[PDB]
Amino acid sequence: STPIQQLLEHFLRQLQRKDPHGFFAFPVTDAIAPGYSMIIKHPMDFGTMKDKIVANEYKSVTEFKADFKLMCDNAMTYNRPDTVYYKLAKKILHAGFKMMS
């Protein structure tokens, strides 16, 4: 396990603690979010991120941060602003980027 993998696994643990319901834990299904796959072109979730870290697919922190932002942006695009998902996405995007400095 490389130094970048160790750091990313660390950041990921810290980020996932901010989503105690695990709304962002696994790919969003069309069943729970109708028409999701026809709206969101590039889905992302923490489970997929973990698998990318394990596969050594991230070669910079920048790349990891981009997938995190993608996840949050997806939630903010698909959901109306008055929803728990949108509000949590906006909260964790800011907190996560700060956290990661």
Ligand X SMILES: CCn1cc(-c2cccc(C(F)(F)F)c2)c2sc(/C(N)=N/C3CCS(=O)(=O)CC3)cc2c1=O
Residues that bind ligand X (CB under 6 A): 23-24, 28, 32-33, 75, 78-80, 83, 85
* Least separation in angstroms between CB 93 and ligand X: 11
Closer to ligand X by Cβ: residue 15 or 75: 75
Closer to ligand X by Cβ: residue 53 or 89: 89
* Least separation in angstroms between CB 3 and ligand X: 30
What is the DSSP code string of 38-74? HH-SS---HHHHHHHHHTT---SHHHHHHHHHHHHHH
* Least separation in angstroms between CB 12 and ligand X: 16
Q: Which residues does a gap of C–N over 2.5 Å follow in the chain?
A: none
What is d(CA 101, CA 95) in angstroms, rounded to the nearest whole number? 10
